[PDB]
Design a protein around this ligand. Structure first.
Ligand SMILES: [Zn+2]
Ligand SMILES: [Zn+2]
Lengths: 244, 41, 304, 103, 339, 47, 24, 47, 69, 45, 49, 28, 49
């Protein structure tokens, strides 16, 4: 895939073909928007189809998108979710966000499909609820823990990271620690997730996952989060008006 | 395990790493020569 | 524990108004997934009859052939389905259209001049100037021209304006009306709008009696908040009449003294027909489609 | 008579060795049946996990995952779900006919 | 389908702009729901498009002149020579039947030149098929020696809103059609209305097009009460706010003061987290069809000298891999992709 | 200045060793960078 | 500065699904 | 009481194009520098 | 051009209510709002459909290449 | 029935080969090709 | 040129004209910017390839 | 202007026809 | 997927790969050959030895 001007090698990456029926345009995910410096304002892109296995191997292992998470300019990320997904995450990972067994399991399968090879355990593993009595309820942060638990290898231990948020503690009320992003053994225990975590921002959750588990897992996490927030924005919409 | 692989085109990568971000400094001054004119010098 | 017989014990239906075109009914103690399913079917999956192939012989009018053809397709026909079989797309046109698969509607209008004293009215100044949906003459053909004897094909709304003409202009066409679903095209949707609204809930936390009760009453539509007396608290007479404008919440004296929610189990459906089928028939067919969809998967081999 | 084999398909790439967990793929279906079917399957006390997922809007596919506890296969849980949804619709159809007469 | 704006400056009437409508009044919801709308992309309702919402047509005229002093080429058909099935498009006079559907390659006219003693035709060539709207024969620039050589043919090209077409409000908020979302999958209002157009909320914080926000609650107020509202600049003050003015109007009609509406999801069916900002905004469909340079080549024609794919989209031409793409392929150290 | 550099090359009676990315592209040779920085040989069992 | 004139006699013209303008 | 749109007035003018002075003088005032400029080429004082 | 058949948003037939609307404004001398209500248009989507209709067809028809003068 | 409409007087008058490209009723040099009875297939979409 | 007005409440005609000045000023700079990174990168890449 | 750039598949890296050409107008 | 591209069926029926027929892929390519150049996943041509 090529988007001119090709100012840096990230503007010419290797993509996996997905033939979509009844289509007249090239469909591209939002995580690619940065590297190509392409905005969907009527932009055009070139698709090249290499005709031999040596050229195939190169477009799948060297020039492929997943191997272009970090730009060689500063070694910082150029891949991440851009708008709806960031606003969706601040709402989904908020303390106020609770989910029933039916809701929780739906959000999991909505973004993680074992048949599409999204899982690493061949069976969707699920955490116990955070509220047992009176009604069984799952927190929003637990969905993020479950997504990692099913996309990261079972042989390796969970991710351990103490990061920060763009949203100050003052906004979340008195005595909140919701600015401190805390991951202990691959479990989101404190803090919401901003542009600073699953955006193209250094030392965030996706970048931390990229360093510990590799580029293929970080790519899976990005696609999984990308689906989850799209599905979450469909069930729970986001709007802007005069009241704001 | 963080070592640069033998064969890596560090030449193109360097010029691309100087070229691509020098597009962000096309705007004029808000004494010394700055941006692209200084980079051209 | 949920049983299908335990659902029969709690599930209730309430018909508020059932007119010949629109029906306002309620579905109490049913899931969102089932209520939304019927809603989706009533719009997209309930089959209906609408013009699909307009064959033009002449069109000297200002309205382009494509536009005029599209307008005829949009005109709902007062035709009951089940009378028509589904058309097969693979076989050619000579085998494709039959007396069981297709309904023909002809339009033949020629505009002329009339002598009258002259701003002057178009019906006075010209003859056959305005082309209406009622001008689509039904032509019964083939094996069955007796099945539609006590059921003539007439548009649901006849006074629909199709075209405007001036003397010299003419429209000559043969429209082929077929069976289709609303998901394919909006012209096939048998409903004008099939939508549900959840029952509004007004949880009064404080008694809020006195003159504040009269202030609280004005925040909701007239027939929603009822006051017993100056005391005896402030109750909700008919929470169903509420528009959910949240007007009560934009007042400091009530912002903390009241909560605005919903009854997740209760659905207030409103189904209006295009004119072909009755609103009940459209809802019944929607339930029959969901059952048939689950039945087709039941008696089906699970391959691989 | 010939039964259609392209409608319901068992994704063997995701099916449990035996027999509780499986992912099913249905053609020409979406949220309409999807959300209604997963709701009914979730009422089963033997179903551990259940959800539905549409791979992409342009492709006419519907995926439904059923993970159960022991003594019941995912196929049985699906067959019970379809059998219960049919009975559920009969209840809706029966109550609506009665209230039409009650008017 | 031209429509008069509910929200308008009174000078719109002073210039009689109603004689030439430029847009249509649409139910626009400021919502992030589909996931296909984001910054430069907006969603159009399928059932709205199916009902003729924002439909347009494009007319193109061609002059078929026979000049290139003795008359050689004559409009019509020559005797003894007649290639198969040409009579389907052209009439006895050699000119096409007004109303006929034409594709690239089809004959658009017919003539006979005595120099070659053969019956030739002028072909119609364009990626977009058309219908004949007007055929005019013009036999001017002669006193007594009259014979037709010049003919003007008008083509009617129907243009339904396609994925890629640009749409914009009167506040400079343009976006390409990302998808034609089905009404069943579309979010449905408490009233039972699904928006015609969906604008993403992430468009407004950067553009700061608050005129559109007040246009939304003004258009809604005017649709309900049935009154046009003045949106002439500097009519309102800091003390006399339009958000308060149309807010009072919205409350009086029986709707939310802040222009919000309780909406339900089309997929799950459940009520959405908060009330969605919905109103009536005058939208304009921009004339450009952005996917005009859409091409694909496997193995097409090549230039004799370079033996490289020849330039030309319609000619089955090749996509150029320039010096920068060469540089990028060297960059990855991907020598076989360059090869 | 293609013809100018060509003239200087001819006058030097220069041998283009085809070791620059540009030169390799001109003669259709595989670029010596990355995957072209080595050779692949097959291990055969029979003597 | 003269304020923007409000519209004369503005009534309710939106109610529930199965509820008309019967309530005055 | 409002700044309304002419609906009845509009449709009547569509059917009946005025026989007197044309409506919307500002529209003719927009092309006033063009028409006036060409008008002064023959008409006006000094010929 | 002419009055559209069905409301773009929901699909309620609006094409039969154009000539009837002008009669309620002319003969009945009613206001824009009350006239739309009597036609059976309560949703603001159906309300704007007729209210906002231009009807350029009447302007377009005045050019007829089939009749002299 | 062969047709040709005059642009000025709107008279439907057709003329064959070796004839002046002008209306008979009035001296007008532009002629509109009229629409004849011919089938044009359309989808009501 | 100090605008006390906001986009929510509206801006006065004097403020409107001044905002028009500053708003256009940026677009004028995008029209008068001869400096391009095209040739600078092309010169480096050909010598460093 | 961007519509012409939207369709054109660039030969190289823009062009030095600006100030760069007048800087190259200096012989050694 | 973030590593994928949505290819229109227009491009899919024109863009072809020269796949050599073997024992491990005879089944996959036989279907493509039957499907032809207008049915996806098909084949536009076959090169003999
Ligand atoms: Zn409507
Ligand atoms: Zn004449």
């Amino acid at each position: 895939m090529n988007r001119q001007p090709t100012l840096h090698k990230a503007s010419m990456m290797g993509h996996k073909v997905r033939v979509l029926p009844n289509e007249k345009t090239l469909r591209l995910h939002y995580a690619n928007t940065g590297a190509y410096n392409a905005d969907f304002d009527g932009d055009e892109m070139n698709m090249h189809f290499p005709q031999n296995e040596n050229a195939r191997a190169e477009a799948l292992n060297l020039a492929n998108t997943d191997s272009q998470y970090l730009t060689p300019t500063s070694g910082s990320p150029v891949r991440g979710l851009i708008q709806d997904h960031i606003s969706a995450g601040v709402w989904l990972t908020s303390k106020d966000s609770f989910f029933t067994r039916e809701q929780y399991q739906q959000y999991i399968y909505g973004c993680i499909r074992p048949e599409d090879g999204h899982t690493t355990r061949s069976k969707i593993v699920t955490l116990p609820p955070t509220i047992f009595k009176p009604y069984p309820l799952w927190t929003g942060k637990q969905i993020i823990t479950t997504v990692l638990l099913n996309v990261t290898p079972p042989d390796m231990p969970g991710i351990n990271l103490i990061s920060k948020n763009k949203i100050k503690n003052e906004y979340w009320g008195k005595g909140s620690l919701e600015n401190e992003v805390l991951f202990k053994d691959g479990a989101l225990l404190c803090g919401i997730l901003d542009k600073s975590q699953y955006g193209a921002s250094k030392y965030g959750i996706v970048h931390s996952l990229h360093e510990v588990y590799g580029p293929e897992v970080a790519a899976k996490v990005l696609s999984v989060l990308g689906r989850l927030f799209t599905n979450y924005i469909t069930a729970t919409a986001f709007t802007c008006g005069m009241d704001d | 395990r963080s070592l640069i692989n033998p064969g890596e085109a560090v030449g193109i990568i360097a010029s691309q790493s100087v070229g691509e971000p020098s597009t962000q400094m096309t705007l004029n001054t808000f004494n010394v020569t700055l941006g692209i004119p200084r980079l051209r010098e | 524990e949920w049983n299908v017989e335990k659902f029969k014990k709690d599930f209730e239906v309430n018909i508020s108004s059932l007119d010949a075109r629109e029906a306002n009914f309620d579905l109490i103690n049913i899931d969102t997934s089932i209520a939304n399913a019927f809603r989706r079917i009533m719009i997209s999956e309930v089959p209906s009859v609408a013009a699909e192939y307009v064959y033009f012989f002449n069109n000297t009018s200002v309205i382009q052939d494509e536009v005029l053809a599209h307008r005829i397709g949009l005109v709902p026909l007062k035709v009951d389905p089940d009378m028509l079989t589904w058309v097969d797309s693979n076989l050619p046109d000579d085998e494709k259209f039959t007396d069981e698969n297709t309904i023909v509607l002809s339009l033949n209008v020629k505009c002329t001049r009339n002598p009258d004293a002259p701003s002057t009215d178009p019906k006075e100044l010209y003859n056959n100037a305005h082309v209406y949906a009622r001008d689509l003459k039904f032509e019964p053909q083939g094996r069955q021209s007796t099945t539609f004897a006590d059921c003539p094909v007439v548009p649901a709304d006849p006074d629909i304006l199709l075209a405007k003409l001036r003397p010299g202009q003419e429209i000559s066409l043969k429209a082929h009306c077929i069976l289709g679903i609303g998901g394919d095209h909006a012209k096939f949707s048998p409903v004008s709008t099939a939508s549900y609204r959840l029952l509004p809930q007004i949880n009064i936390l404080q008694p809020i009696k006195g003159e504040s009760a009269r202030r609280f009453q004005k925040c909701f539509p007239p027939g929603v908040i009822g006051i017993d007396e100056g005391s005896d608290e402030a109750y909700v007479k008919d929470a169903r009449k509420d528009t959910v404008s949240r007007e009560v919440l934009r007042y400091e004296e009530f912002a903390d003294k009241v909560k605005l929610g919903r009854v997740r189990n209760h659905f207030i459906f409103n189904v209006e027909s295009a004119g072909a089928m009755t609103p009940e028939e459209i809802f019944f067919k929607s339930v029959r489609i969901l059952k048939n969809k689950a039945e087709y998967l039941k008696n089906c081999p699970i391959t691989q | 008579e010939e039964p259609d084999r392209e409608k319901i398909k068992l994704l063997t790439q995701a099916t449990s060795e035996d027999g509780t967990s499986a992912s099913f793929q249905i053609v020409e279906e979406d949220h309409t049946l999807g959300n209604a079917l997963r709701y009914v399957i979730m009422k089963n006390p033997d179903v551990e996990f259940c959800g539905y997922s549409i791979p992409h809007p342009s492709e006419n596919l519907l995926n439904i995952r059923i993970q159960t506890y022991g003594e019941t296969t995912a196929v049985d849980a699906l067959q019970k779900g379809l059998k219960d949804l049919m009975d559920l619709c009969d209840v809706v159809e029966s109550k609506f006919t009665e209230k039409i007469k009650s008017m | 389908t031209g429509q008069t704006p509910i929200v308008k400056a009174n000078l719109y009437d002073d210039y009689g702009m109603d004689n030439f409508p430029n847009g249509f009044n649409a139910v626009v919801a400021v919502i992030s729901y589909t996931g296909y709308d984001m910054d430069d992309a907006m969603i159009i309702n399928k059932s709205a498009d199916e009902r003729g919402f924002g439909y347009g047509t494009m007319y193109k005229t061609e002059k078929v002149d026979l000049a290139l002093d003795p008359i050689t080429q004559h409009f019509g058909f020559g005797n003894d020579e007649w290639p198969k099935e040409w009579l389907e498009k052209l009439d006895e006079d050699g000119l096409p039947y007004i109303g006929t559907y034409v594709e690239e390659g089809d004959p658009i006219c017919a003539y006979f030149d005595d120099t070659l003693n053969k019956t030739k035709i002028k072909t119609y060539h364009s990626s977009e098929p058309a219908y004949i709207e007007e055929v005019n024969l013009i036999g001017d620039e002669s006193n007594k020696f009259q014979e037709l050589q010049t003919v003007s043919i008008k083509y009617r090209i129907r243009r339904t809103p396609q994925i890629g077409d640009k749409f914009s409000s009167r506040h400079g908020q343009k976006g390409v059609c990302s998808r034609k979302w089905p009404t069943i999958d579309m979010p449905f209002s408490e009233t039972g209305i699904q928006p015609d157009i969906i604008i993403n909320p992430h468009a407004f914080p950067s553009r700061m097009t608050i005129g559109m926000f007040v246009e939304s609650l003004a258009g809604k107020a005017g649709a309900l009460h049935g009154i046009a509202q003045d949106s002439t600049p500097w009519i309102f003050n800091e003390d006399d706010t339009p958000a308060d003015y149309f807010g009072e109007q919205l409350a009086k009609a029986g709707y939310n003061y802040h222009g919000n509406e309780p909406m339900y999801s089309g997929a799950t069916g459940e009520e959405l987290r908060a009330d969605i900002y919905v109103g009536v905004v005058y939208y304009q469909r921009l004339r450009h069809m952005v996917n005009d340079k859409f091409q694909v080549r496997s193995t097409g024609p090549v230039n004799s000298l370079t033996m490289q794919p020849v330039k030309g989209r319609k000619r089955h031409g090749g996509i150029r891999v320039g010096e920068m793409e060469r540089d990028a392929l060297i960059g990855h150290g991907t020598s076989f992709l360059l090869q | 200045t293609t013809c100018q550099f060509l003239t200087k090359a001819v006058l030097d009676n220069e041998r283009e060793q085809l070791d620059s990315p540009s030169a390799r592209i001109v003669v259709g040779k595989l670029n010596n960078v990355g995957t072209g920085s080595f050779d692949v040989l097959a291990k055969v069992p029979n003597a | 500065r003269k304020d923007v004139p409000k519209v004369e006699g503005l009534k309710l013209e939106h109610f529930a699904t199965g509820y008309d303008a019967e309530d005055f | 009481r409002t700044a309304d749109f002419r609906t009845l007035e509009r449709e009547s003018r569509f059917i009946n194009p005025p026989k007197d002075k044309s409506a919307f003088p500002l529209l003719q005032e927009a092309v006033q520098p063009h028409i006036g400029s060409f008008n002064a080429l023959t008409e006006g004082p000094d010929g | 051009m002419i009055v559209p058949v069905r409301c773009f948003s929901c699909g309620k037939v609006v094409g039969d209510k154009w000539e009837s609307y002008l009669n309620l404004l002319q003969e009945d001398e009613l206001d824009e709002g009350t006239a739309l209500s009597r036609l059976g248009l309560k949703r603001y989507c159906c309300r704007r459909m007729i209210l906002t209709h231009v009807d350029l067809i009447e302007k377009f028809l005045r050019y007829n290449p089939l009749e002299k003068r | 029935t062969l047709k040709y409409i005059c642009a000025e007087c709107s008279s439907k008058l057709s003329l064959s080969r070796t004839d002046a490209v002008r209306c008979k009723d009035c001296g007008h040099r532009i002629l509109l090709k009229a629409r004849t009875k011919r089938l044009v297939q359309f989808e009501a979409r | 040129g100090y605008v006390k007005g906001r986009f929510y409440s509206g801006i006065k005609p004097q403020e409107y004209y001044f905002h028009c000045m500053a708003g256009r000023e940026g677009l004028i700079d995008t029209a008068v910017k001869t400096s391009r990174s095209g040739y600078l990168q092309r010169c480096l890449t050909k010598q460093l390839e | 202007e961007q519509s012409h750039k939207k369709t054109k598949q660039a030969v190289s890296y823009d062009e030095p026809d600006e100030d760069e050409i007048e800087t190259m107008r200096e012989a050694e | 997927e973030t590593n994928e591209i949505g290819v229109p069926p227009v491009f899919a029926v024109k863009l072809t790969y020269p796949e050599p027929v073997t024992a491990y892929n005879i089944a996959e390519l036989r279907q493509a050959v039957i499907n032809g150049p207008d049915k996806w996943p098909g084949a536009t041509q076959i090169q003999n030895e």
